[PDB]
Design a protein around this ligand. Structure first.
Ligand code: R69
Lengths: 20, 338
């Protein structure tokens, strides 16, 4: 499932901004 | 009473504060530092208690040297200049700011319910009514900010605090900017970036409306519309723009999201002649009383459990560090206006 794929991903924690 | 009614006087108030910002309205020794509530590139936000009043606040502490090093002086000056000038129910209130030899300090209202991010991840996903309650507050907040020529540029659950009544307080104005017309900085959070940011096009306030589409999707689905392990893979998915929806999304929600997650700027809701009303009058918001939301008269779907002042059970634990203040002033000219 897409949910399972999300939970197995590296991006379920707090996400940082990118910046110039 | 209505948000439009508020805007008249509110723009005048904002412009006066924007043109002559408040500086140096407290000192570090006036606060007891209690617990770290969050971190960022150049520092952290701590629960503190103002010793004279006993009031609790959330104090952001930024290391001047780290800011200069990473060339982020202008964005940090934007954060403070904008935050001290705004006034809206769904924005964290700046109470005091000041600086010392080493650091910049912003003492903001404490939102004891924690980050939306925490609740969304724990619960999995929000029901459409639950998501809609939050979304409506963001629509009203962007109506306010955009009327002041402000672009927010970092909408995500991590930056949407929940207050004691279950309503939102938007925080972390580090990417917010006052701009008439177009700007060019490649900034924001990967999952939330509009295609025009990624493609180095120049862009405007429409990026906030794209990000609203990402937020509503994430709230309702439990995961954002574009995700992958590397930012570059996320960017590829965004520019392609081929969004697919969970089968449980209502027809009305899908239609709204197709109009927000619209790569074409002549077509993206929030960026048309009718402005915010294309969103407010969308069928997905048919149950939304915009004045009642603005007046905080709607019962929230979720009220955080709160065990008295200074309780932090709605926040994660972070490693604590001593706040260091040098005997030598650092980067004084760079932060003169702060
Ligand atoms: C240019 N860069 C990206 C930049 C610009 C402006 C900045 O202030 C920074 C920072 O270094 C920075 C330093 C610390 C934080 C920070 O800890 N913010 C927390 C945690 C991150 C997620 N957003 C929620 C935020 N917490 C709060 O703001 C908060 C407010 C009220 N009550 C409780 C908490 C955020 C940003 C970095």
């Amino acid at each position: 499932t897409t949910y399972a794929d999300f939970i197995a991903s590296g991006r379920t924690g707090r996400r940082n901004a990118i910046h110039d | 009473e209505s948000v439009k009614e508020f805007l008249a006087k509110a723009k005048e108030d904002f412009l006066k504060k924007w043109e002559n910002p408040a500086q140096n309205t407290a000192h570090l020794d006036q606060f007891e530092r209690i617990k770290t509530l969050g971190t960022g590139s150049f520092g952290r936000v701590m629960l503190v208690k103002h010793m004279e009043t006993g009031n609790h606040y959330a104090m952001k502490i930024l290391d001047k040297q780290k800011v200069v090093k990473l060339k982020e002086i202008e964005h940090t000056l934007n954060e403070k200049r904008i935050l001290q000038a705004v006034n809206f129910p769904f924005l964290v209130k700046l109470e005091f700011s000041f600086k010392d030899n080493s650091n910049l300090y912003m003492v903001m209202e404490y939102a004891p319910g924690g980050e939306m991010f925490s609740h969304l991840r724990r619960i999995g996903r929000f029901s459409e009514p639950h998501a809609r309650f939050y979304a409506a507050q963001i629509v009203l907040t962007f109506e306010y900010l955009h009327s002041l020529d402000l672009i927010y540029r970092d909408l995500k659950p991590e930056n949407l605090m929940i207050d004691q009544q279950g309503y939102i307080k938007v925080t972390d104005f580090g990417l917010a900017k006052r701009v008439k017309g177009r700007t060019w900085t490649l900034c924001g959070t990967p999952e939330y970036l509009a295609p025009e940011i990624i493609l180095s096009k120049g862009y405007n306030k429409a990026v906030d409306w794209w990000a609203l589409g990402v937020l509503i999707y994430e709230m309702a689905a439990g995961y954002p519309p574009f995700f992958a392990d590397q930012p570059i893979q996320i960017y590829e998915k965004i520019v392609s723009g081929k969004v697919r929806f969970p089968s449980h999304f209502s027809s009305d929600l899908k239609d709204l999201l197709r109009n927000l997650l619209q790569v074409d700027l002549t077509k993206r809701f929030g960026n048309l002649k009718n402005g915010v009303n294309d969103i407010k009058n969308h069928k997905w918001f048919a149950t939304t009383d915009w004045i009642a939301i603005y007046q905080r008269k709607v019962e929230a779907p979720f009220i955080p459990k709160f065990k008295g002042p200074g309780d932090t059970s709605n926040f994660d634990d972070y490693e604590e560090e001593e706040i260091r203040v040098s005997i030598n002033e650092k980067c004084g000219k760079e932060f003169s206006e702060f």
